[PDB]
Write a protein that binds this ligand. Structure first.
Ligand SMILES: [Cl-]
Ligand SMILES: [Cl-]
Ligand SMILES: [Cl-]
Ligand SMILES: [Cl-]
Ligand SMILES: [Cl-]
Ligand SMILES: [Cl-]
Ligand SMILES: [Cl-]
Ligand SMILES: [Cl-]
Ligand SMILES: [Cl-]
Ligand SMILES: [Cl-]
Ligand SMILES: [Cl-]
Ligand SMILES: [Cl-]
Ligand SMILES: [Cl-]
Ligand SMILES: [Cl-]
Ligand SMILES: [Cl-]
Ligand code: NA
Ligand SMILES: [Zn+2]
Length: 854
């Protein structure tokens, strides 16, 4: 059954307050609930109450404290219906449920002697009868009764306003949350959990209790997360003017938590693997992700919990806004330019790929079948880009003026994507009617660039033309509102005419007077709009942008564009290119992490995205050639910058020490891609032995695996294993590193690894490490003898015995066959047909069949 956005009607009845009592038990948990309900003025076409409720044993029901007879209501499989209800009333229901029996991972469930919930999107209806929709928001008071011995920790949303014992062996706790919220943000947890408790003083001087809860064995690795909470809270105050709203803030970390992370109000819940970090084991990247994860969920407190989405089509606002915030948070406290490259790589890779597919859709669809239709890079990541485009148009000050007004209008409201744009429009005395078309329109726009200069009058004439092709979901298209952040660079190198211009039309020319010299244009700075850009121009024009442009992004972007075009032409390395490359390498006042990104030659899979028919062997040989040249010609430079980055300071998570370590790593990779590995190998071998952290040991190991000596690779494999048997997370990296070896024997090694006790095909994380890691090893997986495709078909069938979801994922490795040349395309299909013909599970049979028939 398809659900349509245009069908939205407000609920005819609303809930002001919700009072719950939980009497926890393994089998028969009792949920009494007092719903204080009122008729909704915006919808009064009938007086029937339709409550949602699933897998509920109804023991009792009273309206206005008086019992209802079987004739006065109806209970079906999915609802509870009551006719002719009053304008204002209280409805009490007692209900019984079985957490022990719940394997759906929604509502209340129990996994390893600990009660836990999950209510997004519609899991609350599996707890008691409710209006389980996000536009109904209520003030929650929640009592919890349970055994003291087994469940000493009993948590829910808000602040603990009352507590104590009862009977000979039980205790209770009351949690009040005074701010209206939708039920999908409701959470409950009860268990025997260790804790880290700490404090944070707010901007208005209030004392907020911080509390991370986890099992005894996990808690010691949760100390960095606490820091991420403090960084998150402070950044929101400093940049957004958003202060936390309760006296306590809790986190609960448990193994195998399905959602990964969830923004439950005052009580965020995470998978343990996403918030754990030890100094010995976590790399700089691991620490950055823990920060980002914790950040993102904290930011929902305002953008999601305090003001929520009206319906689930509005998910590009609930998450997109919070995603934009999390990527801004990470940008400020780390490197802006690198974070911004990483976010763009996703848009150019996955999002563009999704908008090119039959699955193409707008960020606010007009229809859906299941909730998983919304959980896409289009909705989340292109959603944030749209919010970022408004930041670009208004600037920081005016964007914050728009946030300020957004909360003024809509605190305690469930709202639409149009409501956000209106607040952003109205707070800055502006008209964003044409901009709203971004929410409705599907597909990637293509920007054709054309330009002309006049020597005498000193005028540059830039004309732009936006065209966006028909898609599967819709063929009718329009002229969007495109912000083009730009500048001009004259032959001197000065940056002139720096501003943001707008394209609100199919075609539009822009005139710049008083331009003494024919300039090269710096366009779409920081990827100002999510578009493809046709701008044909020479290598020297790009080399000028690489040399003199203020915009760090366009410097990286133009350099990656040159190196890519060199590879496709099978071309040798230019002389003027080498010297621009050299100067970037020795730049003393430029983010050293940004240097690392610009100097790393695009990986083969990225270059392949340029090609219509992926010529695999053309790519690898041409990239090996240029990487080898840079390694040899600038050999002294790589060595110099390595040893100037290879300092002797104690380990730290300062942005400078982090950036040093990765440029150091980039240098060391070029020393191994040299014709003589003598020098690089010695430096890698020492770093391996001397490193005082995982980031350096990971780098040392990775580069030691590029060694052409068999003894050198083997010993590092063993030496690394000997040290890190005891740490599973690190063993995964050991597998992944081996899987990624660039050498003939990569496949042989991976086959020896499946039989190794470090591997286990039942554990999905080890499958993504070894098998998914081999599928991402470009040269060796796509090896022309086809044994990588055959190894992939085999493993899919072996995995399918234990886990069908994992077997289906690993199968995606074979489903790109359309993109490749006839020889590899056929070997991929053979492998898909081999899977199909070996009687796999329904799941795998269906998916494999689908890509074969596509
Ligand atoms: Cl129990
Ligand atoms: Cl009862
Ligand atoms: Cl009554
Ligand atoms: Cl208390
Ligand atoms: Cl709408
Ligand atoms: Cl408007
Ligand atoms: Cl020109
Ligand atoms: Cl158009
Ligand atoms: Cl600007
Ligand atoms: Cl303009
Ligand atoms: Cl700039
Ligand atoms: Cl080829
Ligand atoms: Cl060292
Ligand atoms: Cl994977
Ligand atoms: Cl396997
Ligand atoms: Na109830
Ligand atoms: Zn989120």
């Amino acid at each position: 059954k398809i659900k349509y956005l245009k069908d939205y009607k407000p609920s005819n009845y609303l809930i002001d307050e919700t009072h719950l009592i939980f009497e926890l038990d393994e089998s028969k948990t009792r949920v009494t609930a007092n719903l204080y309900i009122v008729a909704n003025r915006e919808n009064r076409e009938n007086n029937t109450l339709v409550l949602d409720g699933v897998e509920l044993k109804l023991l009792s029901i009273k309206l206005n404290n008086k019992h209802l007879s079987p004739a006065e209501f109806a209970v079906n499989e999915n609802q509870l219906i009551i006719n002719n209800v009053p304008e204002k009333f209280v409805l009490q229901t007692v209900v019984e449920i079985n957490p022990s029996a719940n394997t759906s991972l929604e509502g209340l469930y129990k996994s390893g002697d600990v009660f836990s919930t999950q209510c997004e999107a519609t899991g609350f209806r599996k707890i008691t009868y409710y209006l389980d929709r996000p536009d109904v928001m209520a003030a929650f008071t929640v009592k919890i009764i349970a055994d003291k011995k087994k469940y000493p920790i009993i948590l829910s949303n808000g602040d603990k306003i009352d507590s104590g014992d009862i009977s000979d062996n039980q205790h209770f706790a009351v949690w009040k949350d005074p701010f209206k919220k939708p039920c999908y943000l409701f959470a409950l947890v009860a268990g025997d959990l260790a804790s880290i408790k700490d404090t944070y003083i707010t901007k208005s001087q209030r004392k907020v209790s911080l509390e991370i809860y986890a099992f005894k064995q996990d808690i010691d690795k949760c100390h960095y997360a606490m820091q991420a909470v403090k960084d998150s809270m402070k950044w929101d105050e400093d940049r957004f003017g958003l202060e936390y709203d309760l006296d306590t803030f809790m986190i609960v970390a448990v193994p195998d938590f399905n959602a990964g992370a969830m923004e439950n109000k005052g009580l965020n819940i995470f998978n343990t693997k996403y918030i754990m970090a030890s100094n010995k084991t976590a790399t700089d990247k691991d620490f950055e992700l823990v920060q980002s994860v914790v950040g993102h969920e904290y930011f929902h407190n305002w953008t999601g919990d305090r003001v929520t989405c009206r319906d689930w089509f509005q998910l590009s606002l609930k998450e997109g806004l919070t995603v934009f915030r999390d990527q801004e948070f990470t940008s400020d406290l780390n490197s802006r330019d690198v974070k911004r490259i990483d976010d763009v790589r996703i848009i150019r890779s996955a999002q563009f790929a999704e908008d090119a597919s039959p699955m193409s859709h707008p960020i606010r669809p007009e229809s859906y079948i299941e909730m998983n239709n919304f959980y896409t890079v289009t909705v989340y990541n292109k959603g944030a880009e749209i919010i970022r485009m408004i930041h670009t148009l208004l600037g920081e000050e005016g964007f914050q003026k728009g946030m300020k007004l957004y909360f003024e209008r809509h605190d305690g409201q469930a709202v639409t994507c149009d409501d956000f744009v209106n607040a952003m429009a109205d707070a800055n005395n502006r008209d964003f009617s044409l901009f709203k078309r971004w929410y409705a329109q599907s597909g990637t726009p293509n920007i054709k660039v054309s330009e002309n200069y006049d020597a005498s009058s000193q005028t540059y004439s830039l004309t732009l033309e936006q065209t966006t092709l028909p898609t599967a979901d819709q063929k009718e298209k329009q002229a969007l509102h495109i912000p083009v952040k730009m500048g001009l660079i004259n032959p001197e190198g000065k940056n002139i005419a720096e501003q943001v211009i707008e394209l609100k039309e199919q075609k539009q020319t822009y005139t710049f007077e008083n331009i003494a010299a024919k300039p090269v244009a710096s366009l779409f700075r920081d990827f100002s709009a999510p578009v493809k850009v046709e701008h044909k121009r020479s290598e020297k024009d790009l080399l000028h942008i690489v040399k003199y442009d203020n915009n760090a992004f366009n410097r990286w972007d133009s350099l990656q564009q040159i190196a890519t075009n060199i590879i496709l032409n099978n071309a040798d390395l230019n002389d003027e290119f080498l010297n621009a490359f050299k100067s970037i390498l020795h730049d003393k006042d430029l983010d050293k992490a940004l240097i690392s990104n610009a100097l790393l030659i695009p990986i083969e899979s990225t270059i392949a995205e340029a090609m219509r028919v992926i010529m695999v062997d053309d790519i690898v040989l041409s990239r090996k050639n240029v990487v080898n040249q840079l390694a040899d010609k600038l050999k002294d430079d790589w060595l110099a910058v390595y040893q100037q980055c290879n300092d002797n300071k104690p380990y730290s998570l300062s942005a400078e020490q982090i950036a040093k370590r990765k440029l150091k790593g980039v240098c060391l990779s070029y020393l191994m891609n040299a014709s003589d590995q003598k020098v690089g190998t010695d430096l890698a071998q020492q770093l391996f032995d001397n490193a005082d952290n995982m980031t350096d040991q990971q780098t040392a190991f990775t580069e030691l695996l590029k060694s052409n000596d068999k003894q050198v690779r083997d010993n590092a494999i063993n030496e690394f294993y000997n040290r890190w048997r005891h740490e599973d997370l690190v063993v995964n990296k050991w597998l992944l590193s081996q899987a990624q070896i660039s050498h003939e024997s990569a496949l042989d090694i991976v086959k020896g690894l499946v039989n190794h006790p470090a591997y286990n095909p039942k554990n999905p994380n080890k499958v993504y490490s070894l098998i998914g890691g081999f599928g991402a090893n470009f040269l060796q997986y796509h090896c022309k003898d086809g044994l990588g495709y055959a190894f992939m078909a085999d493993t899919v069938l072996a995995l399918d015995k234990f886990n069908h979801q994992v077997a289906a994922r690993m199968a995606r490795n074979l489903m790109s066959w359309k993109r490749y040349d006839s020889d590899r395309q056929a070997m991929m299909k053979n492998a898909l047909e081999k899977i199909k013909a070996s009687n796999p599970s329904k799941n795998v049979f269906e998916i494999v069949s689908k890509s074969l028939e596509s």
